Subunit: 116 residues, 4 copies
Amino acid sequence: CPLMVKVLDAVRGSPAINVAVHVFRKAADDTWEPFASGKTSESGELHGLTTEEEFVEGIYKVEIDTKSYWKALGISPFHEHAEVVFTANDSGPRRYTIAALLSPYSYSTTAVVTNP
Amino acid sequence: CPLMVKVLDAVRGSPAINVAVHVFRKAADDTWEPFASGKTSESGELHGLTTEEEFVEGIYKVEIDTKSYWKALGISPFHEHAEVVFTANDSGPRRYTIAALLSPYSYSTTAVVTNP
Amino acid sequence: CPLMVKVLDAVRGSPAINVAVHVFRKAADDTWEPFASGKTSESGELHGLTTEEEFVEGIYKVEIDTKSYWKALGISPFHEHAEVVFTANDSGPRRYTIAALLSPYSYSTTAVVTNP
Amino acid sequence: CPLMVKVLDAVRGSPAINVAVHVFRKAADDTWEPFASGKTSESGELHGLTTEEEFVEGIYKVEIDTKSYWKALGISPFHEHAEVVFTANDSGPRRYTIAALLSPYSYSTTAVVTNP
Ligand SMILES: O=C(O)C(F)(F)C(F)(F)C(F)(F)C(F)(F)C(F)(F)C(F)(F)C(F)(F)F
Ligand SMILES: O=C(O)C(F)(F)C(F)(F)C(F)(F)C(F)(F)C(F)(F)C(F)(F)C(F)(F)F
Ligand code: NA
Ligand code: NA
């Protein structure tokens, strides 16, 4: 998969299920164009966002809707969302896993980048 | 001091010094309007961004220029920048500290919200 | 798998490969008895540490040999190891994933606990 | 102050107050000998653990009693405690800050090592 997102919940010790994720790509005019979106599964994973053909070079923003997640669980969190902004595929195609660990007042994120 | 930003470096075990930080406030048309900015000090801290009178309820974005930080140290980084997006809420404690811990492919951020 | 360990490298944006992991279990006399050990694979994962029969209730310590990992890469890190100490299976069998994200002067760890 | 410990709470967005912290030094027979201890203050900090004269090179372990902390707040935690194990090295900067960020199923820790 060229782009996968994985989200965990640090309060419950579980995957973070039904988290909305929106991906944007910076356009020539420097605006953020919608690129792909989806929801995490029961495993906390979101697959199928894009394809090798469509996932060209660019600056991408992965927005994880953490506030919506916490509020659906009846919790008032600090952040609106968790963002991950990065240049992709600038040395040719790579596979990216963007992982996030959520708490009500904190988040951590990391990337795993592999060459197929 | 209603808003302070603190940035640490997980590779060197040090404050992250001379990191550019930009704060934006979300406007009525949903655009991000410049609000305050500065560079972290030799302690990794950025004080004096705003005043109680200026820092009204609303949605704010703190952008930390991590890419330039890593490049000035000769290190190849993943992210363009780190973002922290949150709502200021008068009901909650009145001082906000936004802390971030930087690594080349990862960052962690937390909020410490307290009262005097 | 009743117990799995997954380790990532925040400097490289990769799995942390060939990381030694030692698991101990607290004995009746309050000493730490060796329980299982192994090394992470090319995916950063360590499977096969134990079995459902052997992984009884107890207090377990998962020691991840982070210093040995960094030193093998020619880096002088801060910590000797990363530890994770927890009571397991006290409400019946669970499956535990212990994840760690490594930097030279920092680490983060989380647990995912599921009921089979 | 050669050694300071700071503890934050990622659920409440606050310092972690009145957390017990024990520091041990590794002895010649590889056992852990009590070295210093205290409880974090209303700022989440524990100062005054040791002096320059007492804090010689060696391996130290900082145990943070996270389980009792979460229980006093009515929250079910995963870990027995959090540990930070490191070597003090006279070559490196002379002040050590050990920071930890707590969630029920996760913790992050970093070291900030600086000179006056
Ligand atoms: O030095 C401080 O006063 C501090 F703000 F507490 C801190 F040490 F920076 C910290 F916030 F604890 C921290 F180290 F940055 C952290 F542990 F919280 C972190 F690294 F986990 C995260 F990234 F969340 F800030
Ligand atoms: O299980 C996975 O494959 C995973 F979710 F991707 C993960 F490796 F666990 C992870 F999310 F990356 C993570 F490592 F657990 C993390 F994000 F939580 C972390 F790396 F930040 C921390 F340090 F917490 F482990
Ligand atoms: Na290129
Ligand atoms: Na029981």
